[PDB]
Amino acid sequence: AFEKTLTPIIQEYFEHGDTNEVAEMLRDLNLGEMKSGVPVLAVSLALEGKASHREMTSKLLSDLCGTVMSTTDVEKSFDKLLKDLPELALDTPRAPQLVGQFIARAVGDGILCNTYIDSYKGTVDCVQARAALDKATVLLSMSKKDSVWGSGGGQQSVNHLVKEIDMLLKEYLLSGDISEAEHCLKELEVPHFHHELVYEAIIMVLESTGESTFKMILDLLKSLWKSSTITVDQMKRGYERIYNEIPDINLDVPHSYSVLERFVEECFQAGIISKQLRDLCPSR
């Protein structure tokens, strides 16, 4: 019933994001011995969710540490965490690697003192604990940035998300790597904003010279379509946005109405939008 007490508190935090509400709740509970319990739970839960949660958890720990518990408490928790890796790694295959990133972040944030890792020197006969530690080590050396986790999540600003979605697309045009793009799209964790993806990828073709961008963006969308990575709805609202904004796009791109139409046709042709949607495309 201490996991029953604490799990809701932490899961809710995951929804709202406000570590103060978590702090208070804990103060109002008076744990003492079991303070070091909390960071064990939280990390466990975060290991079974997405990066965004893992980010939120590092942050919760930074804040909780000072104000509701000590680095002494923190250090115990990670000791526990590494004790557990073998079991954790059964529900979270990359658990060693991931705990290594929490560790690395927790040094970084001084909730783990600067000799935590070397305190493990010539000790482990646990292969997975040592892998956790190596990762943290390596990570820590080469950060002599901003986040080991991503920066996706519905907790980010449309601005930030726009910058990523842009990154992502600019990147694909040089990579050619559809899979790398699917991945980046997933890490944003923002499936009701996928219409931006579609939107910005079409605008890229509109403003582009030659046949390349054309071909590449059409390949991208076809693949995303074929796997359902992007939903029909989200593809729809994507086009509908261009449809509606093609006057203004046309300011910067005189030929815009021309490619738009040529492009939209090749979509219908490759099976990825309906007739309804293809027929609703502005003519000149």
Binding site: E12, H16, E87, L90, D91, V158, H192
Partner: protein, 343 residues
């Protein structure tokens, strides 16, 4: 030529695919569905005290849910189902598994593989193998482990694979494991904002919130509405400030006493996102967002409707703080939220 069995949304009476491997495209959370449960239940020999189906899920939590729902339906038949969870009570878990070989085991590939691979649980009578949300499972790395489990199963085992997206690593599992499968598309409505009117109220600051709410109860003479707050301490404060103004109001916090409240007799309900996960929120015409979610994706889980399944009205209360957010939510969804007039 390539066949499909197509199905429209969600809504034992159920069909029962014996024998055929099945590739099902379905959205996440069908494993929690009464339909999922029956699919498997009705194929268990209740008098073989052995494990007859194996369900893999991408996380312990999803696994418990699947088991919860199966058991809700399974105690009638006398069907047993365990979700492998690990934890402080492993030893008892593992003792149960052995001693009572439950009919249906559900868990992550890693744990299930581990249980198989040290004999706590036998492949002998597993006639059915389901990979719930295969795309999530591949993404978290569970693949070597799915392979390893598959290898232990009888060649006649039915393989069923359910996934929302169908990337090529998921098709590889398909090609590799399955014989002549039946593909099934299951469509459900996307949540949408279309068919919900969205208005805001530019209250100044939190203090002001409580009043602006009760006026609304008057004005709109509301019989039945869902009110959203970002925390449960706040969900409770507010339900008190509410018998101190007397309103027929019930805050959300037992499956039977809660299903009864799902429609008391057109009532009023206060929740967080996490707790309204336990409630069918789109039967209600009016949703009001006392706090506005700090996670933008939570916005449409609060007010979104079924494309025809569901049409409603949603009210947001902002601040100088929160103005910036509500516009972000508006940009996010490509939608309009207008300011609320008297008219």
């Amino acid at each position: 030529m390539e066949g499909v069995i197509e199905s429209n949304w969600n809504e034992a009476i159920l069909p029962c695919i014996k024998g055929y491997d099945v590739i099902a495209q379905a959205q996440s959370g069908t494993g929690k569905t009464a339909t999922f449960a029956i699919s498997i239940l009705q194929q268990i020999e209740l008098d073989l005290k052995a494990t007859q189906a194996l369900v893999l899920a991408p996380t312990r939590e999803l696994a418990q849910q699947i088991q919860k729902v199966v058991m809700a339906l399974g105690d009638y038949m006398g069907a047993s189902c365990h979700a492998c969870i690990g934890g402080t009570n492993v030893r008892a878990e593992v003792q149960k598994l052995q001693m009572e070989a439950p009919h249906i085991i559900v868990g992550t590939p890693g744990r299930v593989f581990d249980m198989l691979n040290r004999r706590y649980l036998s492949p002998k009578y597993i006639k059915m193998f389901v990979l719930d949300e295969a795309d999530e499972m591949l993404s978290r790395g569970f693949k070597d482990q799915i392979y390893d489990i598959f290898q232990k199963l009888n060649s006649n085992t039915q393989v069923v694979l359910l996934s929302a997206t169908m990337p090529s690593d998921v098709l590889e599992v398909t090609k590799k494991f399955m014989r002549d499968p039946i593909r099934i598309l299951v469509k459900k409505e996307e949540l949408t904002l279309e068919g919900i009117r969205q208005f805001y109220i530019n209250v100044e600051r939190e203090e002001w919130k409580l009043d602006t709410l009760c006026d609304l109860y008057e004005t709109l003479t509301i019989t039945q509405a869902v009110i959203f707050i970002n925390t449960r301490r706040k969900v409770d404060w507010l339900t008190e400030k509410m018998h101190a103004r007397d309103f027929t109001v019930s805050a959300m916090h037992r499956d039977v006493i809660m299903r009864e409240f799902r429609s008391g007799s057109s009532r009023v309900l206060i929740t967080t996102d996490l707790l309204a996960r336990g409630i069918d929120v789109q039967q209600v015409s009016l949703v009001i967002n006392y706090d506005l979610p700090t996670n933008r994706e939570n916005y449409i889980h609060r007010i979104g409707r079924g494309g025809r399944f569901g049409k409603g009205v949603a009210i947001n209360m902002v601040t100088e703080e929160d103005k910036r957010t509500l516009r972000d939510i508006e940009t996010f969804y490509n939608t309009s939220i207008e300011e609320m007039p008297l008219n």
